Structure formats: structure tokens, C-alpha cells
């Protein structure tokens, strides 16, 4: 299980430039002076002035040049308010949607806990692009079990903590959080939880930023709120508890492959995953929670896939390893202003 | 209150500017060269030490002495006419 | 663009092209340096010029020779033999 | 590997991979400067010199076997006559 970075700080990406605006032919460029960043170059760019960053670097791949600024095809870019450099701090390790997960398949989708990532999973910065990521404020130590960066694998503490002092690791992790990695595997076929329980708080205040930190309410009553999940979702949530024979793969693989490939299941996304069986603030038990959510104006789907997961679970619940399979439902769809 | 480093267009030129303390630095890798138009400019700039030891083998050669071979062979012709 | 100053990459090497009649200049500050990998600009330069001036006082002294000392020392011992 | 160009400090390092260079190339007329001085003047002010003092070396190859001693045996006669 991989989780790549999906954000970068390349130069040729309008998203990383202030309000959206790349530089333009002939114009001017600002790196804000005191962030430090590596900035990969790809193409080549006409310069009327470029201010660089105090502590930074341009790495210029295949393709990358910076030309003088002349005026036939540059009248447009003119002297028209520099191009500044967004805020290369602003990328957060705890944020759900900066990480895009090596599982993802249609029909299923993952708690927001656990789409940033977890003990047990590899992480990859694309070495195509250059990147900045933060760790956090608090935000007990991140530990996975690798990270690839700069085309090396570190597997070590010992190897990472070398990298992470080293100025190129400096241009690209910032943040008081600690970072570590351990070789482990899970070889449980039950699973293993992801262990971001106790970083949910700063995972949820990543996700909803952009939205003051508060939740956006559900467009249904008596709404759901699973585990790992940051805000309230309309669905079906269904908790298994798991024999010693459970295998957690091959049983969402069956959700998938047998149920959702049924016309009367169309359009509903599933999360399969082993959760602590409490939100209980010390050391609480393990269960397998299967959360459907069904997108679009329908029925309840949700509610209906639920029931066909415990009528699968009391025909084949011993040959599939599932020992109790219970459920809960959210209310009625609210169409107007919650 | 340090001076941003600035690559700038300027009368047509492209200029690279630091500010008052700051350097400007090229750096190879232990393999490669800093060249102008295929000439290795680290072996120039090794002549330069080269250049600065035959002149001290010169200045002490019959040309250099802060008295010259010429003047005193000046003085005797002087000396031995008088 | 491609005929102006430009600062482009080639198979790894940087490369830095002025184009006709047109400079690439790389500016320090009054205390700042310009270092060649291991070597200082300043300190070549004045190495250089040191070099020229003492090359320019060795040139003057070798013209000023006479193209006549061999025959000058046994003009002078002929004159010692005179004595 | 890649080329980069890189600051620390304000500070500018242009720096190249292991077996990578760093390439000066000119036209007809351009100029590599450097704190505002020629760089291809100063790579033909190390040639100039270089050949200056080959000519001087020449020119002190057929002089006296050496004058030096040739010194005191004016003197000692200088002395002889007083």
C-alpha cells in the first residue's frame, strides 16, 4: 500500500503562483525572500526580472532556460505586477487530499484518517516534481514504513534522519513533527488499523481549513459520523466482528467485485478498513467497519447493500472468517438549508 | 535585511546580481570542467601559478637584478676610462 | 529568444549563451566574491596584473643589454692585462 | 544531477552534477563578464604573458656562462689597483 504526493512546487504550474498567475514572457518573478524552497524548471522562460529566494534552488531539468526579456511578443507581459510565488509552506503531511492512495478503484473510496498515510504504508514524493511538505504542529511522530524521495527508499531511522538535517532535506520537509519510518508489515490478513487516531484532530483541522475548521452538516437527519471520519456523511455504516479467518482483502474485494457490480447497487461507494472499536480515549479493541455511501438522488442503496451484507455474513459468515455483523443507518435526506 | 539574489534583463543583457557580502559561485562535480568556447578555463587559470614561477626564475636570472649586468659593467667602463 | 542571452541545459551541463553582441554578467556586491570551483577571480586578476608589470620591467631590461657584454669582459681584461 | 542554480545565504551557486559542466559560449561580440571584467581578456592576458616570457627566456639563453661570478673578478682587481 503506496500514498504519493500529489502537490509540487514546480515552476511551470500556475496553481503554485500567487492567485493563479504564471509568469508571463518578458515579465517579472518574486520567490518570497525567506521561504525556502526547491523549485524544479522545465521549460524555458523570457526574464524582465527575477528575484530569488535567500535559501532555495532552481533545478533546471531537460527543456529548462531563462532568456532575457525583449519586447515583440512580451508587450503583454509589460510591466504588469510581478508574478509572486504562493506560500511553499502551506502543504500539510495531516492533509486528506495531498495524498492519493496506490488501492483506489472504482466503488471504493477511504475514511479521511485514512487517506493520509499510515503505519503501514510506503510513501513516495515523485522524484518528476519537485516538493515542500510540512509536518505539523503537535502531530505525534509520523511513522510509515518507508519513504521514497530524491530516487533513494529509506527504510532506517537512521538513513532518514541523516536526509532530513541535509540541506536537501531541509529545502523539502520543514515543521516541528517528527518523521520516522519502520520496516514492519502488518501480516495480519485481518488488517491493521491505520493508527491516526490520535493524530484525527490535526488531520481534520488540515482538511477543513479551507473551511474555517468547521464541519459542513449532512443533507440528512440522525446523519453518521464513522470512524476516522472528520464530518457527518448520509449512509449505511455496517461493523463486523472478525474471526481469526477473516481476510480483510479478499472480503473488500467482495463488496466490490460481487455486490457493486449489481444494477440495484449502482452508483454507491464503499470504505473497508479495521477501526479501534471505540472512539475510547485509552487503548480501546479492533472491528471491521464497512461504510456505504451512495452519491446521486436515490433510495437507500446505503441502507439496502447493508442488509445484503448481513444476510451474506448469516449465510457464509463462517466460511468468511465474520463472527457478528451489526449495522446503523442515517435519517431522511433534508433537501433545503440545514 | 540580507539582499535577495537577482537575475535580471538589463540593455539587453542577462545580468545575475548578489548583494554586498554575497557570492557568486561556479561549481562542477570532481569530473566536470568550467569551459569558455571549449577551452578549460581551470588549466588557464593554472597558468597564471605557472606564468608566476618563471618570472621568479627570470628575476633571478642575468635580466631582474635591481642593479643591472648593464650597470655594472656601466661602472667600470666608467671607472677605468676615468 | 533563442538568439539573445539565455541560460539553458545540455545533457547535465549548464550552459550560458550571450549571442551576438550581447553580454552575460554575473555582479557581486563591494565585499562579495566570484569563485571559479576552487579558484578566487580577484585573487587571479591581481596575479595577472602583477605578472604583466614585472614582465613589462623584464622586457625593458633585456632590450636595454648590451649585445656586446662577452666582448666587453675581454675588453676589459685586455685592458687588466695592460695594467 | 540536474543543473540547478542554487542560493544559501543570498549567496549564488550555479552548480553542476558529478561529470557535468558549466559552459560559457559567445557570439561574435559577446562578452562573459565577471564583477565587470572580460573573462576571454583575461584568458588572452594569461596568453600574452605566457609568450612574453617564453621571448624573455630566449633572450636570456646566450648570456655570459654566469656574470655573477664574473662580479668579483672586477672588484678584485678594482681593489688591486687602489
Same mark, same amino acid.
Given at each position: 500500500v503506496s500514498k504519493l504526493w500529489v502537490p509540487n512546487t514546480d515552476f511551470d504550474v500556475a496553481a503554485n503562483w500567487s492567485q493563479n498567475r504564471?509568469?508571463? @514572457?518578458?515579465?517579472?518573478?518574486?520567490?518570497?525572500?525567506?521561504?525556502?524552497?526547491?523549485?524544479?524548471?522545465?521549460?524555458?522562460? @523570457?526574464?524582465?526580472?527575477?528575484? /530569488?529566494?535567500?535559501?532555495?534552488?532552481?533545478v533546471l531539468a531537460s527543456g529548462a532556460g531563462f532568456g532575457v526579456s525583449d519586447v515583440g511578443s512580451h508587450l503583454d507581459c509589460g510591466a504588469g505586477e510581478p508574478a509572486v510565488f504562493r506560500d511553499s509552506?502551506?502543504?500539510?503531511?495531516?492533509?486528506?487530499? /495531498?495524498?492519493?492512495?496506490?488501492?483506489? !478503484?472504482?466503488?471504493?473510496?477511504?475514511?479521511?484518517?485514512?487517506?493520509?498515510?499510515?503505519?503501514?504504508?510506503?510513501?513516495?514524493?515523485?522524484?518528476?516534481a519537485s516538493f515542500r511538505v510540512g509536518l505539523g504542529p503537535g502531530a505525534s511522530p509520523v511513522r510509515?514504513?518507508?519513504?521514497? @524521495?530524491?530516487g533513494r527508499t529509506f527504510t532506517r531511522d537512521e538513513d532518514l534522519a541523516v536526509f532530513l538535517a541535509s540541506r536537501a532535506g531541509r529545502l523539502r520537509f520543514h515543521g516541528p513533527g517528527?518523521?520516522?519510518?519502520?520496516?514492519?508489515?502488518? !501480516?495480519?490478513?485481518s488488517g491493521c488499523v491505520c493508527g491516526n487516531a490520535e493524530a484525527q484532530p490535526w488531520i481534520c483541522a488540515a482538511l477543513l481549513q479551507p473551511l474555517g475548521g468547521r464541519c459542513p452538516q449532512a443533507a440528512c437527519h440522525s446523519a453518521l459520523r464513522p470512524q476516522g471520519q472528520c464530518c457527518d456523511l448520509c449512509g449505511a455504516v455496517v461493523l463486523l466482528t472478525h474471526g481469526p479467518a477473516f481476510d480483510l482483502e479478499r472480503y473488500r474485494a467482495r463488496i466490490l467485485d460481487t455486490f457493486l457490480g449489481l444494477p440495484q447497487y449502482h452508483?454507491?461507494?464503499?470504505?473497508?478498513?479495521?477501526?479501534?472499536?471505540?472512539?475510547?480515549?485509552?487503548?480501546?479493541?479492533?472491528?471491521?467497519?464497512?461504510?456505504?455511501?451512495?452519491?446521486?438522488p436515490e433510495t437507500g442503496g446505503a441502507g439496502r447493500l447493508?442488509?445484503?451484507?448481513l444476510a451474506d455474513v448469516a449465510e457464509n459468515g463462517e466460511a468468511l472468517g465474520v463472527l457478528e455483523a451489526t449495522m446503523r443507518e442515517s435519517g431522511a435526506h433534508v433537501w433545503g438549508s440545514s | 535585511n540580507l539582499q535577495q539574489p537577482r537575475m535580471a534583463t538589463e540593455r539587453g543583457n542577462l545580468v545575475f546580481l548578489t548583494g554586498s557580502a554575497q557570492n557568486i559561485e561556479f561549481r562542477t562535480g570532481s569530473l566536470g570542467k568550467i569551459k569558455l568556447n571549449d577551452e578549460?578555463?581551470?588549466?588557464?587559470?593554472?597558468?597564471?601559478?605557472?606564468?608566476?614561477?618563471?618570472?621568479?626564475?627570470?628575476?633571478?636570472?642575468?635580466i631582474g637584478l635591481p642593479q643591472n649586468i648593464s650597470s655594472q659593467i656601466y661602472q667600470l667602463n666608467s671607472k677605468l676610462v676615468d
Open positions: 504564471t509568469p508571463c @514572457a518578458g515579465g517579472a518573478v518574486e520567490f518570497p525572500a525567506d521561504k525556502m524552497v526547491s523549485v524544479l524548471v522545465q521549460e524555458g522562460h @523570457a526574464v524582465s526580472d527575477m528575484l /530569488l529566494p535567500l535559501d532555495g534552488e532552481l509552506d502551506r502543504f500539510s503531511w495531516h492533509d486528506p487530499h /495531498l495524498w492519493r492512495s496506490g488501492d483506489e !478503484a472504482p466503488g471504493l473510496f477511504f475514511v479521511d484518517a485514512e487517506r493520509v498515510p499510515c503505519r503501514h504504508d510506503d510513501v513516495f514524493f515523485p522524484p518528476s510509515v514504513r518507508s519513504i521514497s @524521495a530524491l517528527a518523521l520516522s519510518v519502520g520496516p514492519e508489515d502488518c !501480516a495480519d490478513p452508483g454507491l461507494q464503499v470504505a473497508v478498513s479495521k477501526v479501534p472499536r471505540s472512539s475510547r480515549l485509552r487503548e480501546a479493541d479492533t472491528e471491521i467497519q464497512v461504510v456505504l455511501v451512495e452519491n446521486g447493508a442488509r445484503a451484507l | 578549460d578555463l581551470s588549466e588557464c587559470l593554472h597558468q597564471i601559478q605557472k606564468n608566476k614561477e618563471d618570472i621568479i626564475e627570470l628575476k633571478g636570472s642575468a
